[PDB]
Tab-separated table of C-alpha atoms in Angstrom:
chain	number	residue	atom	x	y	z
A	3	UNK	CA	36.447	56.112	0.829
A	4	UNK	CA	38.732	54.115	2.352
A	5	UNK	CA	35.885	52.270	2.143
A	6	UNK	CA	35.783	51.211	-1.610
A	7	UNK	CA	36.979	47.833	-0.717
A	8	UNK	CA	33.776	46.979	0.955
A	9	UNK	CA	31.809	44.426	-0.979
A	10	UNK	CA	28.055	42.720	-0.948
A	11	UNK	CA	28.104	38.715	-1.229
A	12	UNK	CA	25.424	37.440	-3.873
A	13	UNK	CA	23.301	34.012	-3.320
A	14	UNK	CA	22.727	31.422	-5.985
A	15	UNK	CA	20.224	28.977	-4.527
A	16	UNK	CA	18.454	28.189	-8.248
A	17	UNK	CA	19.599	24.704	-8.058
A	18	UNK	CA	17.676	24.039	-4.742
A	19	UNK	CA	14.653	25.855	-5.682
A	20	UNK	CA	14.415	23.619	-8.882
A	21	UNK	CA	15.429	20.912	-7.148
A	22	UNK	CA	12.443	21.461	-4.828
A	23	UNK	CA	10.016	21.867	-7.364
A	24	UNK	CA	11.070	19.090	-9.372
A	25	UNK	CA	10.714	16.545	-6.492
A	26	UNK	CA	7.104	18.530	-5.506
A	27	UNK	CA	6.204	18.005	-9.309
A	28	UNK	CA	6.491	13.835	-10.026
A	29	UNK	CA	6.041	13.004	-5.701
A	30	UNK	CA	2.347	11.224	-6.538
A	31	UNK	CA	4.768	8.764	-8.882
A	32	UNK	CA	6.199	7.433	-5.567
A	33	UNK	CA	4.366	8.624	-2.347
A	34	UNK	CA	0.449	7.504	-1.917
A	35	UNK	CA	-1.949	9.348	0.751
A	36	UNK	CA	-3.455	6.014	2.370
A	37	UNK	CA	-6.582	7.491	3.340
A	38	UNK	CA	-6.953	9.284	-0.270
A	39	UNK	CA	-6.591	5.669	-1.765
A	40	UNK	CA	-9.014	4.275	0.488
A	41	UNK	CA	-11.980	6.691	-0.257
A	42	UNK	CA	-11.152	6.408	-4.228
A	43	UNK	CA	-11.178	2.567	-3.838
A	44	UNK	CA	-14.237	2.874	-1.646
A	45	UNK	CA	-15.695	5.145	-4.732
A	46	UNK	CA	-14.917	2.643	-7.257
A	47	UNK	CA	-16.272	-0.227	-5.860
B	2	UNK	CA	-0.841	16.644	-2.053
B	3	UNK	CA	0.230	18.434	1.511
B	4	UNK	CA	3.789	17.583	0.797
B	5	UNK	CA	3.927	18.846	-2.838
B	6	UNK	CA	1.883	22.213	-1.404
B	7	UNK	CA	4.747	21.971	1.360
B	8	UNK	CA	7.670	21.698	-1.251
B	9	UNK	CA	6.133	24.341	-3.945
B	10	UNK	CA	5.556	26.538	-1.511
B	11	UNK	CA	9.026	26.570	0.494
B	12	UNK	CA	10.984	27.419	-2.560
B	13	UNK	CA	8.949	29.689	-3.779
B	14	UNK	CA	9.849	31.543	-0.529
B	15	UNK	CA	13.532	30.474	-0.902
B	16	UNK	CA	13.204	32.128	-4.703
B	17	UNK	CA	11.662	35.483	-3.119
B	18	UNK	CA	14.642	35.665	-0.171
B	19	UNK	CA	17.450	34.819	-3.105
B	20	UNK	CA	15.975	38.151	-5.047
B	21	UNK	CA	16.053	40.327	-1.984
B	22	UNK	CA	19.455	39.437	-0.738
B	23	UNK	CA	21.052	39.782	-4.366
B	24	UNK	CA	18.841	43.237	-4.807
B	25	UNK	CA	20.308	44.504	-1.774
B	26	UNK	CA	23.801	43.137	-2.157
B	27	UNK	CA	23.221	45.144	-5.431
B	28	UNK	CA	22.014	48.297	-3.462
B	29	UNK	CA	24.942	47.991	-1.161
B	30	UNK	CA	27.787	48.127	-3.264
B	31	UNK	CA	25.864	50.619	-5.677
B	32	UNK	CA	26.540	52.449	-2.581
B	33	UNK	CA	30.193	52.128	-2.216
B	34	UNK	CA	31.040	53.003	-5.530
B	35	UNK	CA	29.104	55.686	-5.535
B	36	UNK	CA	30.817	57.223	-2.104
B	37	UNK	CA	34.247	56.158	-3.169
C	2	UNK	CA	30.510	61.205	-5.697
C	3	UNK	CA	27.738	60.117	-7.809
C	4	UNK	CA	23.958	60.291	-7.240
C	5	UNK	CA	22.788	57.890	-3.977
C	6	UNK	CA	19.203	59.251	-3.757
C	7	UNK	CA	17.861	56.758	-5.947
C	8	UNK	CA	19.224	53.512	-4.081
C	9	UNK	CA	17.208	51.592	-2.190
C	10	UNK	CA	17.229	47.929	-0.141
C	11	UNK	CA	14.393	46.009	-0.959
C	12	UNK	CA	11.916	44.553	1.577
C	13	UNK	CA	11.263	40.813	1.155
C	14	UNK	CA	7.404	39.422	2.143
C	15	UNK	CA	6.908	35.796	2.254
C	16	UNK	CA	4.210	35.761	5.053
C	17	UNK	CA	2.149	33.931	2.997
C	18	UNK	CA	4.230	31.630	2.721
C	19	UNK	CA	5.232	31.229	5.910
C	20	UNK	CA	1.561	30.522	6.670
C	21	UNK	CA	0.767	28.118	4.530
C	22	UNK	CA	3.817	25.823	5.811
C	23	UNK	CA	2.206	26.536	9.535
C	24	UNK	CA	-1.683	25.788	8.073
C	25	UNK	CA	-0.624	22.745	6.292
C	26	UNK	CA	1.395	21.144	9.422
C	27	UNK	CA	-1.386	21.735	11.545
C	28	UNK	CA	-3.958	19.633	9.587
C	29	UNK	CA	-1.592	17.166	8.210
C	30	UNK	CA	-2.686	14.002	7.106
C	31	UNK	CA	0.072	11.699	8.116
C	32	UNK	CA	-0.684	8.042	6.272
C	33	UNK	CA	1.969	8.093	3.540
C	34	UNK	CA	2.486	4.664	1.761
C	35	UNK	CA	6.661	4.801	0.193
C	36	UNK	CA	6.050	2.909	-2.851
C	37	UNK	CA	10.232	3.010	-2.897
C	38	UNK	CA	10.401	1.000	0.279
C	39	UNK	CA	7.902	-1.322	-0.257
C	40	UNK	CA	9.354	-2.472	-3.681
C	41	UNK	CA	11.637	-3.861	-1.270
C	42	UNK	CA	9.247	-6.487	-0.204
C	43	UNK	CA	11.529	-9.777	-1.766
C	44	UNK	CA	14.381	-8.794	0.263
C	45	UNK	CA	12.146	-7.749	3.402
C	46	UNK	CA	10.005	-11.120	3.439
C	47	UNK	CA	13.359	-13.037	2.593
D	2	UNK	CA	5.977	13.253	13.844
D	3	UNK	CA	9.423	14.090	11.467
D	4	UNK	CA	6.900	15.201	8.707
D	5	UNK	CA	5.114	18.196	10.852
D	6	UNK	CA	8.332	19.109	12.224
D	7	UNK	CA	10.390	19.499	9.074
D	8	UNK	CA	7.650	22.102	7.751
D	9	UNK	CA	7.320	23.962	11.231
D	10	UNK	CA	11.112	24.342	11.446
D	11	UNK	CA	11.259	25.078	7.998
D	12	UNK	CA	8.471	27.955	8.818
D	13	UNK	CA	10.448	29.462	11.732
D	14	UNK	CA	14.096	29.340	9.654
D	15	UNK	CA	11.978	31.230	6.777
D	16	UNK	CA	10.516	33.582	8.916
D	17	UNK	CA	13.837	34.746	10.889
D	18	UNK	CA	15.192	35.259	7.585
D	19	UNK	CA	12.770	37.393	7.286
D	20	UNK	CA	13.239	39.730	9.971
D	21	UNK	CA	16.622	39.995	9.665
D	22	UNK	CA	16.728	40.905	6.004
D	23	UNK	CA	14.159	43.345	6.181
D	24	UNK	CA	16.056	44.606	9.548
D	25	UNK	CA	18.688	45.081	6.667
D	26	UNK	CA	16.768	46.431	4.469
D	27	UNK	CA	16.019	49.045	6.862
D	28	UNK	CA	19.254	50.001	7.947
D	29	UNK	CA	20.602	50.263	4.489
D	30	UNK	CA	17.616	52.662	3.276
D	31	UNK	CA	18.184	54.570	7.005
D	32	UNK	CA	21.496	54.886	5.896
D	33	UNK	CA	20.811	56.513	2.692
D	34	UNK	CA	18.241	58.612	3.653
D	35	UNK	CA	20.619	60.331	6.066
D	36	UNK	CA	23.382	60.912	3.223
D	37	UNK	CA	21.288	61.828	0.824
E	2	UNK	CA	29.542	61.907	8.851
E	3	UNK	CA	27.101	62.476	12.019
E	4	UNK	CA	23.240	61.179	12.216
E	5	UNK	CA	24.482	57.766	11.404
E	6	UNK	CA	26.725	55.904	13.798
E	7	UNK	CA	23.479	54.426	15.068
E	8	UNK	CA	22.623	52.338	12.152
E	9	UNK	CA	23.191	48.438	12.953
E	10	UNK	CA	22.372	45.217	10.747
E	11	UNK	CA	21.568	42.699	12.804
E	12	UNK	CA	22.540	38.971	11.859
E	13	UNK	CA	20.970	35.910	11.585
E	14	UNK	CA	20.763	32.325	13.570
E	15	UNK	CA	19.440	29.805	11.989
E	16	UNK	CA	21.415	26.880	12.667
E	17	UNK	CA	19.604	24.930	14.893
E	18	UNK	CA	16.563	24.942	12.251
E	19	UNK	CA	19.319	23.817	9.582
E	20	UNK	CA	21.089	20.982	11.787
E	21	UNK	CA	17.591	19.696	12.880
E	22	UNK	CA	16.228	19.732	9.169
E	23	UNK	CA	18.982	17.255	8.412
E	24	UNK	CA	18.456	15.157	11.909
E	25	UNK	CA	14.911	14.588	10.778
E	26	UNK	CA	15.922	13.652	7.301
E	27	UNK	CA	17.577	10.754	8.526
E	28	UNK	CA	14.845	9.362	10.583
E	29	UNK	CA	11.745	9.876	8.170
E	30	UNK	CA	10.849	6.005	8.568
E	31	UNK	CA	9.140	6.927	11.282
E	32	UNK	CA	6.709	9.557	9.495
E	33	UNK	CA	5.805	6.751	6.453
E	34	UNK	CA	4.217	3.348	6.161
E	35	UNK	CA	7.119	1.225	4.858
E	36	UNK	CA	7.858	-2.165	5.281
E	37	UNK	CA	8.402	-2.252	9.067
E	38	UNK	CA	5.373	-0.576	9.299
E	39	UNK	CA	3.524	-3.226	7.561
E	40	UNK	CA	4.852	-5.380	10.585
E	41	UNK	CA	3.604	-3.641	13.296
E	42	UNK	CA	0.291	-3.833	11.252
E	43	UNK	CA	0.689	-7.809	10.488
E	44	UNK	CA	1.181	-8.000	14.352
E	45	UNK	CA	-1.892	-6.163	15.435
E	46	UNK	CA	-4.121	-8.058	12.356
E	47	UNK	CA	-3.616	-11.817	13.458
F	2	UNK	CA	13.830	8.989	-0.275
F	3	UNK	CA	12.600	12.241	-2.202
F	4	UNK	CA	11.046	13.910	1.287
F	5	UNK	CA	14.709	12.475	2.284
F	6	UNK	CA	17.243	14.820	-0.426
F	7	UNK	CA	14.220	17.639	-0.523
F	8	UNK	CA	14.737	18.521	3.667
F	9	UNK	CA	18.726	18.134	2.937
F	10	UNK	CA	18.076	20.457	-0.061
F	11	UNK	CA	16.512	23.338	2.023
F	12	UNK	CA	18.859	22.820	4.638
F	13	UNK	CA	21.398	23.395	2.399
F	14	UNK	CA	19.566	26.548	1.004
F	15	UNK	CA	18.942	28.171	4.184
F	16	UNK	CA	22.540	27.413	4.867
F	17	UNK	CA	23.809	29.512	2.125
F	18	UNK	CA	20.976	32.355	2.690
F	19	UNK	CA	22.778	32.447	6.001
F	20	UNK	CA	25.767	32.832	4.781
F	21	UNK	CA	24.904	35.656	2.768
F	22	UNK	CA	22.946	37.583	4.961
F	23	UNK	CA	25.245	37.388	7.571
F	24	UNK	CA	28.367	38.736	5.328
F	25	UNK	CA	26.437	41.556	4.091
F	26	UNK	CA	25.153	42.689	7.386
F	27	UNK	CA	29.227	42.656	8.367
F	28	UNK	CA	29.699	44.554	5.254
F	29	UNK	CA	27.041	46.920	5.709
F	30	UNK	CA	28.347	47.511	9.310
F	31	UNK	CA	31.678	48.038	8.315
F	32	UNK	CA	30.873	50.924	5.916
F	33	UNK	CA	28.603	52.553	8.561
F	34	UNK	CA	31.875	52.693	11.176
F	35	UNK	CA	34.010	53.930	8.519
F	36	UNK	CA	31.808	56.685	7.303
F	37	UNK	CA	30.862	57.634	11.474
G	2	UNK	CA	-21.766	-64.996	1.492
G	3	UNK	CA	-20.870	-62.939	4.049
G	4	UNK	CA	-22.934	-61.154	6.571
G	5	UNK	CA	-24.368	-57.597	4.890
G	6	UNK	CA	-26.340	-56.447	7.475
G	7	UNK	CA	-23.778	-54.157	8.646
G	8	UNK	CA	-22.216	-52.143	5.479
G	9	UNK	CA	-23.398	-48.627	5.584
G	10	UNK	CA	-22.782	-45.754	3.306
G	11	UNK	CA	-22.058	-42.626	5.106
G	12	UNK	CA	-23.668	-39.456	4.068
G	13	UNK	CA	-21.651	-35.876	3.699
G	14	UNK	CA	-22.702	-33.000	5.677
G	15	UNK	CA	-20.822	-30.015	4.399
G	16	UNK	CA	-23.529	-27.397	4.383
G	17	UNK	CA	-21.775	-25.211	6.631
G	18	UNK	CA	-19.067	-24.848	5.199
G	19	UNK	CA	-20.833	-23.988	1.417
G	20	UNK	CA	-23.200	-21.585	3.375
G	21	UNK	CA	-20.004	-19.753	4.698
G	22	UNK	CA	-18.290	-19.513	1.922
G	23	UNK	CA	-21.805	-17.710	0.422
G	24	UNK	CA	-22.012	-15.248	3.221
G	25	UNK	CA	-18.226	-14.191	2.927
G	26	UNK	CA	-19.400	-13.848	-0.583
G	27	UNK	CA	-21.674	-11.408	0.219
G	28	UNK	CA	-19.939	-9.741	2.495
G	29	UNK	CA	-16.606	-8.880	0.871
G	30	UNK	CA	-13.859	-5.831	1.458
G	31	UNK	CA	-12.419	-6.298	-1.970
G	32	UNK	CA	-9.764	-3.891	-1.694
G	33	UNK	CA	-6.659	-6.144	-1.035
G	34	UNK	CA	-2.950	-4.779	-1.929
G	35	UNK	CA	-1.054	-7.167	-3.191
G	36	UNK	CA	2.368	-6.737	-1.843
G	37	UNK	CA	4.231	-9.489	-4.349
G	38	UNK	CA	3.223	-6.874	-6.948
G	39	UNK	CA	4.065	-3.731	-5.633
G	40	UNK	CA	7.331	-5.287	-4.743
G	41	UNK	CA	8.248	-4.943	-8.500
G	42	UNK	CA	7.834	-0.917	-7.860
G	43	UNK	CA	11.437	-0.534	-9.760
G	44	UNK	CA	11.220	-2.066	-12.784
G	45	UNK	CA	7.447	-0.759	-13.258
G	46	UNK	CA	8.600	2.978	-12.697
G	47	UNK	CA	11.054	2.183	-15.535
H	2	UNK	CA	-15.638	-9.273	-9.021
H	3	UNK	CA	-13.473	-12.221	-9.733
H	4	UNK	CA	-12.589	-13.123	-6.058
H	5	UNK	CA	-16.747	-13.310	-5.265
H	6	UNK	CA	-16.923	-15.430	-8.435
H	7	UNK	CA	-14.576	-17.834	-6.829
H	8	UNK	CA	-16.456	-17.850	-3.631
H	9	UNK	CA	-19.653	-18.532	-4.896
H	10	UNK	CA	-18.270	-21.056	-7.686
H	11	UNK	CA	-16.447	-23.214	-5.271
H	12	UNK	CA	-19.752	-23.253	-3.067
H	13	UNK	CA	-21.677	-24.121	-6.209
H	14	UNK	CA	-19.402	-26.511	-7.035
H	15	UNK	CA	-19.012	-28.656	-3.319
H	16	UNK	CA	-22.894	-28.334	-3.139
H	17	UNK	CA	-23.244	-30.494	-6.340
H	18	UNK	CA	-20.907	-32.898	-5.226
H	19	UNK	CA	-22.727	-33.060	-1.699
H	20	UNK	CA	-25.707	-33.821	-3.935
H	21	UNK	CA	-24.395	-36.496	-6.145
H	22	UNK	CA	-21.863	-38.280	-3.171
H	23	UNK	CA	-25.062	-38.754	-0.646
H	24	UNK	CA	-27.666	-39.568	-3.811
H	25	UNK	CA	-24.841	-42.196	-4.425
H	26	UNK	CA	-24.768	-43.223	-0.414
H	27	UNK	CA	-28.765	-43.226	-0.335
H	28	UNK	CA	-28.555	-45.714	-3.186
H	29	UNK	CA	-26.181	-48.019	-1.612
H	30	UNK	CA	-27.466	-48.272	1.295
H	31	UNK	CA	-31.188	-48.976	-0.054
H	32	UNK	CA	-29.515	-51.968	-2.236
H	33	UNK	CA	-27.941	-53.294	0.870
H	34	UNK	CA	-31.108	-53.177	3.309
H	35	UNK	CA	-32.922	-54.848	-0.077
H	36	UNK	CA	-30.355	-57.382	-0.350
H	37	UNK	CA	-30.020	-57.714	3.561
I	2	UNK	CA	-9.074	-12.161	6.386
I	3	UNK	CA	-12.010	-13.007	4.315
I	4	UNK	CA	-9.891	-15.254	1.791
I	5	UNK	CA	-7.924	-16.661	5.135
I	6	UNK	CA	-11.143	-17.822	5.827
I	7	UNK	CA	-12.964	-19.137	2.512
I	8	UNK	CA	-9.773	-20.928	2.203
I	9	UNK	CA	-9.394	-23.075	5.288
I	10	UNK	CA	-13.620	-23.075	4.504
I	11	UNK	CA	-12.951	-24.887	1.631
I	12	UNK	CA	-10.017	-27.090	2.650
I	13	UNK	CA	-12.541	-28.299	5.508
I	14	UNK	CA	-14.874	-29.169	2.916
I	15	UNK	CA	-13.163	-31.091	0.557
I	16	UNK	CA	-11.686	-32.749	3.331
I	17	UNK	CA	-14.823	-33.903	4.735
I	18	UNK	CA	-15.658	-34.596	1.291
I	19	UNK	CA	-12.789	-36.679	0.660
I	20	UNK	CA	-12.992	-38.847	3.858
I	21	UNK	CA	-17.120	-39.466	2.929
I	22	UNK	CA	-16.154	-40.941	-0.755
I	23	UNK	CA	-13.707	-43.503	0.743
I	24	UNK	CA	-15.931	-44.428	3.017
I	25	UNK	CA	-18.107	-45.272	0.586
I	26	UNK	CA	-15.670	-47.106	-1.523
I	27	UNK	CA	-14.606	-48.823	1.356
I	28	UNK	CA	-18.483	-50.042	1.454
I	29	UNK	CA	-18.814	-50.874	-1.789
I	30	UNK	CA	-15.696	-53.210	-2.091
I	31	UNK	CA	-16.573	-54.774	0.859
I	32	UNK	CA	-20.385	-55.598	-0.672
I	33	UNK	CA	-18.874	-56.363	-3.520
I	34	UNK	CA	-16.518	-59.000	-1.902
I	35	UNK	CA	-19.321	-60.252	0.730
I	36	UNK	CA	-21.242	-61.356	-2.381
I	37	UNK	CA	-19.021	-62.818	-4.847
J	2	UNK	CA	-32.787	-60.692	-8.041
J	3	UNK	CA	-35.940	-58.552	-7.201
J	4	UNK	CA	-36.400	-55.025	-5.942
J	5	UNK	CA	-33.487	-53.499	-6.842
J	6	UNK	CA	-33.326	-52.697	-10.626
J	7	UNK	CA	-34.986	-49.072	-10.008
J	8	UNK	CA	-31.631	-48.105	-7.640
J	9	UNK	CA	-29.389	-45.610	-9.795
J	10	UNK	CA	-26.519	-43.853	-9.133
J	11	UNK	CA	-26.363	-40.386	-10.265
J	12	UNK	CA	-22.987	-38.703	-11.640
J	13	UNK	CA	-22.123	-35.077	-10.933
J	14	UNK	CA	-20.980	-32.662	-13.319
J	15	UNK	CA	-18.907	-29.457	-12.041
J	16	UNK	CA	-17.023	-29.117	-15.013
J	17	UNK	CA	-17.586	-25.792	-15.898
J	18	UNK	CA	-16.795	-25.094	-12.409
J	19	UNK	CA	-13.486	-26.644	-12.571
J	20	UNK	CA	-12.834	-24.641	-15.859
J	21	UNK	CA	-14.244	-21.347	-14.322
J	22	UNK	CA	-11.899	-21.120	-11.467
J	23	UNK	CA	-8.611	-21.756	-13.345
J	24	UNK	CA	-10.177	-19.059	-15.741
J	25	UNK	CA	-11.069	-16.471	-12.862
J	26	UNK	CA	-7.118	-17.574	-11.628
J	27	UNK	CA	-5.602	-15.749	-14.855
J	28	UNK	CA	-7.356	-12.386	-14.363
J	29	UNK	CA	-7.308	-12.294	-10.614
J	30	UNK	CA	-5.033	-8.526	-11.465
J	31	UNK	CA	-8.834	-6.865	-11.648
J	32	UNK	CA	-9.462	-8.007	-7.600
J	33	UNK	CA	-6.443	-6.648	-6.398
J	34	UNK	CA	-4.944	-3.450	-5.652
J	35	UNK	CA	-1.089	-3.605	-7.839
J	36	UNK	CA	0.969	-0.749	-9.295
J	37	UNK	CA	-1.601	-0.655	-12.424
J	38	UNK	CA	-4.486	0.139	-9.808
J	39	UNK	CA	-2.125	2.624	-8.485
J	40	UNK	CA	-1.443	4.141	-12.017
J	41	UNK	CA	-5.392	4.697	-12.209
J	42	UNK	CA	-5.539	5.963	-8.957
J	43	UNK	CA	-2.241	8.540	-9.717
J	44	UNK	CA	-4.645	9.758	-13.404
J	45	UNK	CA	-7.436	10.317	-10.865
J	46	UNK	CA	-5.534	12.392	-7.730
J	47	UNK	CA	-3.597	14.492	-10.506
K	2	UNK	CA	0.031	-15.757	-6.696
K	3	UNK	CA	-0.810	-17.224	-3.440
K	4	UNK	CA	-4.722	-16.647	-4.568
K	5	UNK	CA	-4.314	-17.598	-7.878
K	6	UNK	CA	-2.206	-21.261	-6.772
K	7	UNK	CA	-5.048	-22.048	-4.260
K	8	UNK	CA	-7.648	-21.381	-6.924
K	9	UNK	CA	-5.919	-23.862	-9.277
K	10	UNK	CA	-5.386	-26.004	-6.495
K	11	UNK	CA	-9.207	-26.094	-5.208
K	12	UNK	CA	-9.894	-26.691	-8.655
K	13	UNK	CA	-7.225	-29.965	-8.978
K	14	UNK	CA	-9.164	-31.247	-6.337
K	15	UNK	CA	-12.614	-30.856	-7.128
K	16	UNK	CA	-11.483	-32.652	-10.716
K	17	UNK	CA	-10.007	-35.524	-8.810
K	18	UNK	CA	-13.250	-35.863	-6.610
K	19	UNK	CA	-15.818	-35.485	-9.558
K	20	UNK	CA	-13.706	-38.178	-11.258
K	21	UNK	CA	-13.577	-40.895	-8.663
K	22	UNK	CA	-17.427	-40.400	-7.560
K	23	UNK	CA	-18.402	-40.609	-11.429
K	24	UNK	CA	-16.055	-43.992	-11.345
K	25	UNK	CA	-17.864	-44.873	-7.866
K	26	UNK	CA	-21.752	-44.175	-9.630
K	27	UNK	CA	-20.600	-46.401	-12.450
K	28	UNK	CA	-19.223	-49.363	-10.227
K	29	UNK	CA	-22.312	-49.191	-8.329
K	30	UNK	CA	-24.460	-49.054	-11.105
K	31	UNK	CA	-22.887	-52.279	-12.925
K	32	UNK	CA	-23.161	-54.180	-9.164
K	33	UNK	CA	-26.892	-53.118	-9.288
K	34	UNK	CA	-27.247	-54.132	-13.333
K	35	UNK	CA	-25.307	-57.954	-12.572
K	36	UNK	CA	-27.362	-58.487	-9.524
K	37	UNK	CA	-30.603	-58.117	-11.312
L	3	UNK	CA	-20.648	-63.003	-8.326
L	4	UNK	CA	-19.420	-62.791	-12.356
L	5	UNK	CA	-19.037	-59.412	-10.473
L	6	UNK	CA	-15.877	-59.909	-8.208
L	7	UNK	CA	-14.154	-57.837	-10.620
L	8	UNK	CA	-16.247	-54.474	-9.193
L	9	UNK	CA	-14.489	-52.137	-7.998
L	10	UNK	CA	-15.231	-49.001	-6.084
L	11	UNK	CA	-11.770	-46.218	-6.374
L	12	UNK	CA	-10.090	-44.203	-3.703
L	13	UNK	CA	-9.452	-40.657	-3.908
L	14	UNK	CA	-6.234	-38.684	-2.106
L	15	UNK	CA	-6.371	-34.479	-2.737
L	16	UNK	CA	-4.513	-34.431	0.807
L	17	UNK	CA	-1.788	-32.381	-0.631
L	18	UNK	CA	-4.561	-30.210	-2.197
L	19	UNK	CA	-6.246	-29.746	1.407
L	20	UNK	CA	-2.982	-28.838	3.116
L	21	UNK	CA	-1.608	-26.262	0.002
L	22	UNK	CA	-5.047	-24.372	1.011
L	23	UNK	CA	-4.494	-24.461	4.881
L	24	UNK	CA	-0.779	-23.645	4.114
L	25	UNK	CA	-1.959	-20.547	2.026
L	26	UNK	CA	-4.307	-19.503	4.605
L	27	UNK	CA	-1.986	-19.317	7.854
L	28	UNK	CA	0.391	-17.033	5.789
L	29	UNK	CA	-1.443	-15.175	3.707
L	30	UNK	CA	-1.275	-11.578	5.711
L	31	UNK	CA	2.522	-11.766	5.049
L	32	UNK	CA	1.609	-10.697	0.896
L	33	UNK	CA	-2.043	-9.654	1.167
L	34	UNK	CA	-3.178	-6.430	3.042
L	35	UNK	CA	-6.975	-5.236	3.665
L	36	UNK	CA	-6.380	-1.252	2.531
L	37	UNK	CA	-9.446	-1.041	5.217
L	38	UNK	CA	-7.998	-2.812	7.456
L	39	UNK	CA	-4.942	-1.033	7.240
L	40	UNK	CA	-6.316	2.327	7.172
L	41	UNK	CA	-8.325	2.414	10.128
L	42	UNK	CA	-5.412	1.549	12.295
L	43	UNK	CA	-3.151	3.452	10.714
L	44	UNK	CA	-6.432	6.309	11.806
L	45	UNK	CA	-6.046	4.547	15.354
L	46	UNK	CA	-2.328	4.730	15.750
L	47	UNK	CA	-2.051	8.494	14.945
């Protein structure tokens, strides 16, 4: 091996994937499905 | 809901490509060492 | 040289995944109210 | 609109990831079949 | 080392998915109901 | 503005998968031509 | 004394007007947003 | 709810003056073709 | 739309209502200064 | 003079519909769709 | 707030009606009391 | 006429009667009919 300086890179997305799930986790606090609002309006009243 | 499913489900991909490419960074320089 | 019978490269499978994105873009419900951008409204109407 | 296309591109990118690591994949474990 | 020259790893393209996620992140207005929405709406209502 | 930083957040992810993959495919290459 | 003959009180007619305002009653789509409010989205999510 | 009540409460409300303003009207005008 | 229109509704009533009371003033002071 | 001491003016009384709508004007919240509606809504699509 | 100030508002006015046809009544009702 | 002294008042709730019209003309700039709203939103797309 002339070879022994050959090396593998190594990923580190674990911010983005939390990231990710952290927006997916709180998104009803700020995004509203018109038509799902409608129908539970239309339920309520 | 479709965009939370969206979000969830793209990283959880993301989170199964990081552990691939690391496992076979892994297996590829496992290999080096082992043939130098 | 030591032992290389017992590496191996993983295979990664995220067709399910991959589906879902695809099943969920195709029936997408597209109405989305930003309550961000409508708590804008004083400056908007102004 | 943007919102379907963000997930469909997001869908392909994912899946020619995919390929290509498990391409790889298979060209690493081809390799060490053969030495081993 | 013969039975091996063969072996390629291929590599990937993915920057046109990358460079369009960003384009589309810019221009998501479009996608929700936000205040200019609402105009377009007021418009049609009277 | 959270649909907003979550598409610029997996762009940057698949970004850096790219990265990766692509080295490591070099890297594998490179020990297959040395060892043929 | 002056001539009387002529003074007349005039009589209100504003029963279409009440009658409308019962059969909006009636008839109402009570699900108005109330975009004032929702312009205070910051300081509520705080 | 309180948006019918306000409907129905103003209508109550200008139908008992329409009442009372051409009661008052009637009156006048019978003391005037009495007096005339 | 429906409060758009109990509103101008209502201002159309007490307007009528308004102009039918000073009428009626207007009768009464004048009786009242055709007798005296 | 004769044949007019029966005539009588009546006097209306709407009071408590006076007093009602600046009570039904506090609570008008109830009728409308603001962000504690949308709070409700959020308990119920969670 | 725009419902709420033209609830008050319909309300200010049917106060100042009631209170100037109750004054009207009374007027005509002392004309009607001298004359006889 | 020991009744010259009757008198019959005037009311004025003008500025009452054009508050209301006022209100009215402008009122879809703060108030929105979710309905209303949703089924052209349903038309658009």
């Amino acid at each position: 091996g002339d070879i022994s300086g050959i090396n593998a890179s190594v990923v580190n997305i674990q911010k983005e994937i939390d990231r990710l799930n952290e927006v997916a986790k709180n998104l009803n606090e700020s995004l509203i499905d018109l038509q799902e609002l409608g129908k539970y309006e239309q339920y309520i009243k | 809901s479709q965009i939370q499913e969206s979000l969830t489900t793209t990283s959880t991909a993301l989170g199964k490509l990081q552990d691939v490419v690391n496992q076979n960074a892994q297996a590829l320089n496992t290999l080096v060492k082992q043939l130098s």
